[PDB]
């Protein structure tokens, strides 16, 4: 609805800053609304889920096994691995990584997962070859939320991310258990609450990942819909703003506010 | 009753019940269960996607278990961060704790995990010492320069670091 426009417009008029928008009918992928659709914003924390896409597709093949267990040590740690950190003399299932780096932003859960598939590269060849000429991976966990400006790594377009997203989730890419297994672990999702989820009514269905990162940038994909079933791909990105946290924590929100209004 | 900080942190000790953290850290900042096992899990403000943030661990489930593990993340600021990358190049494997600081920084380093696998003993215990620079720190954004430090026994077996000039 027009009206949400008008939102993603005050947010950029608020934030002093880009704010790419889409969204997708979940069943057709038909673009109901978009904003600078093919603008590139750094995918931050939201490429986790991207990442367990081509993780769950190895799996898939059998080339990967969910209860395969990954033995790291302190090397391996950066910046912000509450559950990795945990479970350091114990070691981690692929399954319990791919958990802890879609519903927490374990950093060396994503690590250890992109290890398992060959490293960045291996990602973006991942994307390539299902049709997304345009989403890249770049870097591995902390230096890709760099988000320098113009700097085109680790970054996607709204539309590139919001169809990538829908082809995980409903496309034959991955087989029913794995699309079920991401779904369900965006719909446990932790680390969202001040967005999005901040205005589902109650009933609703919602499954997310969001991102954060320097230089203001922010964002988050989801997959919604009311009656507990998504019907709906959402795809919002932000960079370059000075403004704080629960500034740009809240020009989404209310983004999503006005998304779920005129429903 | 306040979020988990960095003075509860310190003023919990090694050998203290789960009540004894709870009361200290305040119940409604922690959660036990889920990713974190029987560990104890308790969060500060808000730190880009997720919050600064304290994980204890326990000898055991039990009730009478006791603290054997105090980690932490962005609840600790550095007193007097002067790590560089050249400073950081000087440290060598084999050095003990007094040493890495003579060459790191007296200032420079938060203890990021600590734990004693043989609780009560001391014996084998590993350390992990997260290390900043002039500006690496920050108990809301991401670390622009740091370094990850750690030893067993007090004696240094690794490092590593992140944006260090
Ligand atoms: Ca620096």
Same mark, same amino acid.
């Given at each position: 609805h027009?009206? !949400? ?5 005050? *947010?950029?008029?608020? @934030?002093?800053?880009?704010? +790419?928008?889409? =969204? $997708? ?54 910046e ?11 070691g ?10 879609? !519903? ?5 859960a *994503?690590?250890?997962? @992109?290890?398992?598939?060959? +490293?960045?590269? =291996? $990602? ?30 680790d ?95 809240r ?13 | ?17 789960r ?85 790191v ?61």
């Open positions: 027009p009206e !949400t426009l008008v939102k993603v417009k005050d *947010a950029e008029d608020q @934030l002093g800053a880009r704010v +790419g928008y889409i =969204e $997708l009918d979940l069943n057709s992928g038909k673009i109901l609304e978009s904003f600078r659709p093919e603008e590139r914003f750094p995918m931050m924390s939201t490429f986790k889920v991207l990442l367990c896409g081509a993780v769950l597709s190895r799996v898939d093949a059998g080339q990967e096994q969910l209860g395969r267990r990954i033995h790291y040590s302190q090397n391996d740690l950066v912000y691995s509450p559950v990795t950190e945990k479970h350091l003399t114990d981690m299932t692929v399954r319990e990584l791919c958990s802890a780096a879609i !519903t927490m932003s374990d950093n060396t *994503a690590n250890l997962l @992109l290890t398992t598939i060959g +490293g960045p590269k =291996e $990602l973006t060849a991942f994307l390539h070859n299902m049709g997304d000429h345009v989403t890249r991976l770049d870097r591995w966990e902390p230096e890709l939320n760099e988000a320098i400006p113009n700097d085109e790594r970054t996607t377009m709204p539309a590139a991310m919001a169809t990538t997203l829908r082809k995980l989730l409903t496309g034959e890419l991955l087989t029913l258990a794995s699309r079920q297994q991401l779904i369900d672990w965006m719909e446990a999702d932790k680390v969202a609450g001040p967005l999005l989820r901040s205005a589902l009514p109650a009933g609703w269905f919602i499954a997310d990942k969001s991102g954060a990162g320097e230089r203001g940038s922010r964002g988050i994909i989801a997959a919604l819909g009311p009656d507990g079933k998504p019907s709906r791909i959402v795809v919002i990105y932000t960079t370059g703003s000075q403004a704080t946290m629960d500034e740009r924590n020009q989404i929100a209310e983004i999503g506010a006005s998304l779920i209004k005129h429903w | 009753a306040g979020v988990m900080t960095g003075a509860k942190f310190t003023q919990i000790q090694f050998g203290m019940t009540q004894q953290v709870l009361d200290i850290a305040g119940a409604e900042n922690c959660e036990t269960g889920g990713s974190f096992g029987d560990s104890i899990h308790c969060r500060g403000h808000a730190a880009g996607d997720y919050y600064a943030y304290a994980t204890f661990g326990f000898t055991s489930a039990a009730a009478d278990a006791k603290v054997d593990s105090k980690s932490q993340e962005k609840l600790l600021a550095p007193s007097a961060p002067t790590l560089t990358l050249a400073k950081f190049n000087q440290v060598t494997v084999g050095m003990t704790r007094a040493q890495v600081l003579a060459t920084g007296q200032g420079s380093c938060t203890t990021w995990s600590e734990y004693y696998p043989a609780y009560p003993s001391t014996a084998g215990v590993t350390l992990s010492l997260s290390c900043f620079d002039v500006d690496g720190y920050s108990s809301t954004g991401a670390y622009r320069g740091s370094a990850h430090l750690w030893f067993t026994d007090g004696v240094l077996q690794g490092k590593r670091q992140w944006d260090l000039v």
